[PDB]
Design a protein around this ligand. Structure first.
Ligand SMILES: [Zn+2]
Lengths: 137, 57, 76, 38, 97, 142
RNA sequence: CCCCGAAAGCUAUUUAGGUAGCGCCUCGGACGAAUACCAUAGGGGGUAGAGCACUGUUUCGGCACCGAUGCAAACUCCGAAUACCUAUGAGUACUAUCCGGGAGACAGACUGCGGGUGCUAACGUCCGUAGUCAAGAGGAAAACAAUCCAGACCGCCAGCUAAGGCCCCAAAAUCAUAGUUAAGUGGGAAACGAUGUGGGAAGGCAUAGACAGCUAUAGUCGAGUCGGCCUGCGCGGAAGAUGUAACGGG
């Protein structure tokens, strides 16, 4: 369950998720990677579930690079509570995802095994993904 | 030296400056045609409301 | 019950006379909390860093000096 | 017969067919692999 | 001499955001050619040929020929822009060599 | 008062006979409704019935396209609770072919006393014979 | 009977459904280009975007530092479009300003755009900004204040158009030329599933004989065959209570 060790502020504005992921869309650490093709939110539990699935499939024979970190807190009201009376309490952490953002990379396994692991992990995610490989430019 | 401009759409719900551009060109109603000097100052007003005028150049 | 809910009254800072305008002696040019702009020729500085004109003329902004400070002056 | 939103081939003796606009899977070896999408 | 890209001149009326989007809707790719002792020249490439060439690995380390009309330029690829989500090439840079 | 209305006492109703063998139901019904209302006459008047008499023969030979022969549904409600009755084109054309034409043309005629009067001029028969030889209908190929 | 025509805001209030000053309406007088729209010229910015130079935060290596790699309303080495201020100028327009008599109003609503809050719920709530209603009829939306087109001085059995339409209810094309769909899709919905069909760019094997079937890699036969990528339109996923009832009907 990834989460920042400490934060400068506790609660943040909702914001709007727009635009494409020009940064963080290039394979840098491994040889094969999975990237999102539509935008959304990615929770820490989702990140952990996908990582566990990939590691279990590849039997820890390679290295998995996680390139998403959930540094955005999300609040909810305590339930049965009326509107107003201040902002709600922090409940979980998410990472904003834009189309093109790379989520996981794998180093040191066969392409077939890596693609099987990525197909297994894609079923755990709330958005559509695709598979990319390292290229010269 | 002069061009003819015709109003082709209603101006009732347009922006304030767009209505003022129509008035400063002298157009008063749909189908009205006026003849104005061809100067950059007039061209600015015409271009701002391009979407509801027709220019016989 | 929230512990927040306070704020102060507005202070209405900012540039009052822009470049190219003509001023009379005594006119306030810039209201500022600190010296974002510095006083050039014919411009005086008040106790709260307000910049005002000390002569009649035209206001001009510039960037000058070895520190790259912003200056505003009055040309007679 | 299994009724699922997702129907797929299980082994090498399964066949995917369409009857009256319905996708079905029929297996020659194992009757328990028989599927119908719905 | 092994790699040859047939191109067309990309004029001022074909430069800009809207013109580039129209070109890419036509399945064409904008590119620029710059390098010592001559002014830059803007050209239009075919997406099909660009993808075919990029599939080869020796294309990134070999002198290639961009041919527009009768003019011929000997260049090496310098930079490429891809779509963040679709990986389609969108613009090319070529340094004279 | 220069535009004149047609007078009911001066209207002439003419008799026509139409064969339904192989025709598409709706594309026949539109023409039947037009001629029943009198839209084809230069004395057309909205409040006056100026149309003609239409005799449809071979009613059970009418056709529908696609899969409508099995899928097109005809509903009615007896006003008792749960009294919704349902049938389809395949059964209805075999059982009561005239009701299909009655529904199709009634849906295209005006809804009121004048429409009720207009639809009385259409005679539908399943066989190839009609009992109106005395009126000497003319063959109308619509 | 004729002319003009608001507001539901700010500030304060034992004030909050009241009232007062200001903002907005009207009438009289004074004074005329001092006003506005647009063009050109001068000017400050720290938002959108972006970035890691500070403040925080993040991953992987090497030895707090070095190399790669992300994030930010209360971070900034940078940084627009618009908006705002000033001067000059053409054309168009009853504009601007000052002094007085009379007010009403200080419960707003929806929609688009930028946001806070809420669950990126609510015909929810609170701001900024524009339009409409309020105080506005007509036409199109089946019916439908707030959407689209358009601003009704009176009369006409005259004509042209806007939005939207032209088989019948019901005015106008059963108009013309190319394709696609077979689901009544059109005329409600997701992850996901599948040899449904149209188009496109590549790749593999093959008449010194390919794929399938068939006989013990060889052999009968006699041309195409195979597996992926992009894309148009379709299919399943899809259960509710009065009666078809999710094209207004035919
Ligand atoms: Zn099986």
């Amino acid at each position: 369950m990834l989460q920042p060790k400490r934060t400068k502020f506790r609660k943040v504005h909702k914001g709007r998720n727009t635009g494409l992921a020009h940064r963080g869309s290039t394979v840098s650490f491994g040889s094969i990677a999975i990237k999102a093709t539509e935008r959304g939110r990615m929770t820490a539990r989702q990140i952990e579930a996908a990582r566990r699935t990939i590691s279990r499939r590849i039997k820890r024979g390679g290295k998995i690079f996680i390139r998403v970190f959930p540094d955005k807190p999300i609040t909810e009201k305590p339930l049965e509570v009326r509107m107003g009376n201040g902002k709600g309490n922090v409940e979980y952490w998410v990472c904003e995802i834009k189309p093109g953002k790379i989520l996981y990379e794998i180093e040191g396994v066969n392409e077939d095994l890596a693609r099987e692991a990525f197909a297994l992990a894609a079923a755990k995610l709330p958005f559509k993904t695709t598979i990319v490989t390292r290229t010269v430019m | 030296k002069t061009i003819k401009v015709t109003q082709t759409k209603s101006s009732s719900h347009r922006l304030k400056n767009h209505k003022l551009c129509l008035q400063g060109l002298g157009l008063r109603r749909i189908g009205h045609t006026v003849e104005v000097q061809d100067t950059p100052s007039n061209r600015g007003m015409i271009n701002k409301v391009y979407y509801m005028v027709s220019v016989e150049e | 019950s929230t512990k927040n809910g306070r704020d102060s009254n507005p202070k209405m800072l900012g540039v009052k006379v822009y470049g190219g305008q003509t001023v009379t002696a005594g006119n306030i040019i810039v209201r500022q909390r600190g010296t974002e702009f510095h006083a050039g020729a014919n411009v005086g500085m008040g106790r709260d860093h307000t910049l005002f004109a000390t002569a009649d003329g035209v206001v001009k902004f510039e960037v000058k000096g070895q520190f790259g400070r912003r200056y505003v002056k009055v040309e007679t | 017969m299994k009724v699922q939103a997702s129907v797929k081939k299980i082994c090498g003796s399964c066949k995917v067919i369409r009857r009256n606009g319905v996708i079905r899977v029929i297996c020659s070896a194992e009757p328990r692999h028989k599927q119908r999408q719905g | 001499a092994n790699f040859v890209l047939n191109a067309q001149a990309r004029a001022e009326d074909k430069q800009g955001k809207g013109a580039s989007r129209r070109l890419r809707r036509e399945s064409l790719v904008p590119a620029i050619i710059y390098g010592g002792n001559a002014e830059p020249v803007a050209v239009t490439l075919e997406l099909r040929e660009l993808v075919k060439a990029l599939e080869s690995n020796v294309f990134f380390e070999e002198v290639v020929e961009i041919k527009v009309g009768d003019k011929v330029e000997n260049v090496k690829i310098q930079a490429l822009q891809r779509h963040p989500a679709k990986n389609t090439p969108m613009h090319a840079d070529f340094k004279r060599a | 008062m220069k535009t004149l209305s047609a007078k009911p006492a001066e209207v002439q109703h003419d008799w026509f006979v139409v064969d339904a063998t192989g025709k598409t139901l709706g594309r026949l019904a539109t023409e039947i409704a037009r001629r029943l209302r009198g839209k084809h006459k230069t004395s057309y008047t909205p409040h006056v019935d100026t149309g003609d008499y239409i005799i449809v023969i071979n009613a059970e030979q009418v056709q529908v396209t696609g899969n409508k022969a099995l899928d097109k549904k005809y509903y009615r409600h007896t006003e008792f609770p749960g009294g919704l009755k349902e049938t389809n084109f395949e059964k209805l054309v075999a059982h009561k072919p005239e009701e299909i034409f009655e529904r199709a043309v009634k849906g295209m005629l005006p809804k009121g006393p004048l429409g009720y009067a207009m639809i009385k001029k259409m005679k539908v028969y399943a066989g190839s014979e009609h009992p109106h030889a005395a009126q000497q209908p003319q063959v109308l190929d619509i």
